[PDB]
Amino acid sequence: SELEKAMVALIDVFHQYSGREGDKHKLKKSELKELINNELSHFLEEIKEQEVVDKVMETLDEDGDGECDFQEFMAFVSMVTTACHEFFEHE
């Protein structure tokens, strides 16, 4: 039942960077850039340009309001989780 301890980690990760600066209730591309670069520094995604952030936000901020809600940010993990899983092939 790892999903049990892992879910607690995701709930803490939500407040760990979301309440770091700006509006803790919603995530702005600037705060999300820190989330992507602070949790995925060089493990798989390296952020150095706003273009990755801008393209990544259109993926979550499908509202175009330049903001990402907890539900929208949670989906980003799934996309990376799905891509990271691909790293494992048959071997």
Binding site: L44, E45, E46, V52, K55, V56, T59, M79, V80, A83, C84, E86, F87
Partner: peptide, 12 residues
């Protein structure tokens, strides 16, 4: 033996 996946594949 270390490699990185692809940011472009994830973007689209």
């Amino acid at each position: 033996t270390r490699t990185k996946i692809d940011w472009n594949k994830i973007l689209s």
